Write an enzyme that holds these catalytic residues in place. Structure first.
Site, PDB file in Angstrom:
ATOM      1  N   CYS A 162       0.830  -1.141   0.097  1.00  0.00           N
ATOM      2  CA  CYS A 162      -0.139   0.109   0.011  1.00  0.00           C
ATOM      3  C   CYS A 162       0.825   0.996  -0.002  1.00  0.00           C
ATOM      4  O   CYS A 162       0.645   2.121  -0.600  1.00  0.00           O
ATOM      5  CB  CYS A 162      -1.167   0.214   1.162  1.00  0.00           C
ATOM      6  SG  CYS A 162      -0.613  -0.340   2.671  1.00  0.00           S
ATOM      7  N   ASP A 221      -8.275   2.068  -3.723  1.00  0.00           N
ATOM      8  CA  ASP A 221      -7.583   1.334  -2.877  1.00  0.00           C
ATOM      9  C   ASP A 221      -7.239   0.102  -3.274  1.00  0.00           C
ATOM     10  O   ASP A 221      -7.966  -1.052  -2.663  1.00  0.00           O
ATOM     11  CB  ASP A 221      -8.524   1.141  -1.524  1.00  0.00           C
ATOM     12  CG  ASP A 221      -7.808   0.465  -0.123  1.00  0.00           C
ATOM     13  OD1 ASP A 221      -6.673   0.119  -0.583  1.00  0.00           O
ATOM     14  OD2 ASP A 221      -8.555   0.321   0.761  1.00  0.00           O
ATOM     15  N   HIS A 223      -2.677   0.876   6.941  1.00  0.00           N
ATOM     16  CA  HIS A 223      -2.910   0.665   5.447  1.00  0.00           C
ATOM     17  C   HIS A 223      -3.170   2.125   4.728  1.00  0.00           C
ATOM     18  O   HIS A 223      -3.182   3.202   5.538  1.00  0.00           O
ATOM     19  CB  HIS A 223      -4.424   0.092   5.319  1.00  0.00           C
ATOM     20  CG  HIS A 223      -4.696  -0.415   3.758  1.00  0.00           C
ATOM     21  ND1 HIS A 223      -4.034  -1.071   3.252  1.00  0.00           N
ATOM     22  CD2 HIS A 223      -5.818  -0.027   3.170  1.00  0.00           C
ATOM     23  CE1 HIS A 223      -4.301  -1.368   1.930  1.00  0.00           C
ATOM     24  NE2 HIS A 223      -5.694  -0.688   2.032  1.00  0.00           N
TER      25      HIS A 223
END
Length: 166
Positions: free
Chosen positions: A34, A87, A72
């Site tokens: 991420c 995402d 995250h």
């Protein structure tokens, strides 16, 4: 329900991202990715005409005594007066008690929140700079009880946390 919104051409955008072999490999293998995906995803969104790009830093807390929360990162942008969240590594959590996060997400901001809710204490903050986001939502020890909730946006508010806080 769905991982990819129809409000924007999310399915096309995911395919286009996956035409990049480095991004394709990180979507195939999202664990630990991420943070490195923020810049490339932001560049992508900007070139597609999203603006007001922000970097979303997220914590996921399982219990009050957890020494290091799970972090995250996602990217948020405006298109025609609505926010969308890219995402594309959400599914890093599929095998960690969030099985409903079973693929990359490109969703409206409200759909994104909905997705995480249907999937623990989860909160976030949006930042203008990806390194600021990374620093604020880092992987070093943190005590939940002494964290400032100032500037934190709750996705969830589990009973344990409300009891914990008193």
């Amino acid at each position: 329900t769905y991982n990819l919104t129809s409000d924007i051409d999310a399915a096309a955008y995911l395919e286009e991202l996956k035409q990049n072999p480095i991004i394709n490999n990180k979507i195939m293998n999202p664990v630990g990715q991420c943070e490195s995906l923020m810049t490339p995803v932001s560049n992508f969104m900007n070139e597609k005409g999203f603006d007001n790009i922000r970097y979303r830093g997220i914590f996921i807390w399982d219990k009050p005594t957890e020494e290091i929360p799970t972090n995250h990162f996602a990217v948020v942008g405006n298109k025609e007066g609505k926010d969308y969240v890219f995402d594309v590594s959400a599914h890093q959590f599929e095998n960690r008690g969030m099985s409903n996060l079973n693929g990359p997400l490109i969703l409206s901001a409200d759909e994104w929140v909905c997705k995480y809710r249907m999937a623990k204490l989860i909160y976030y903050t949006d930042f203008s700079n990806s390194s600021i986001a990374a620093n604020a939502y880092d992987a070093l020890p943190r005590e939940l009880e002494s964290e400032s909730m100032a500037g934190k946006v709750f996705v969830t508010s589990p009973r344990w946390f409300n009891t914990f806080k008193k």
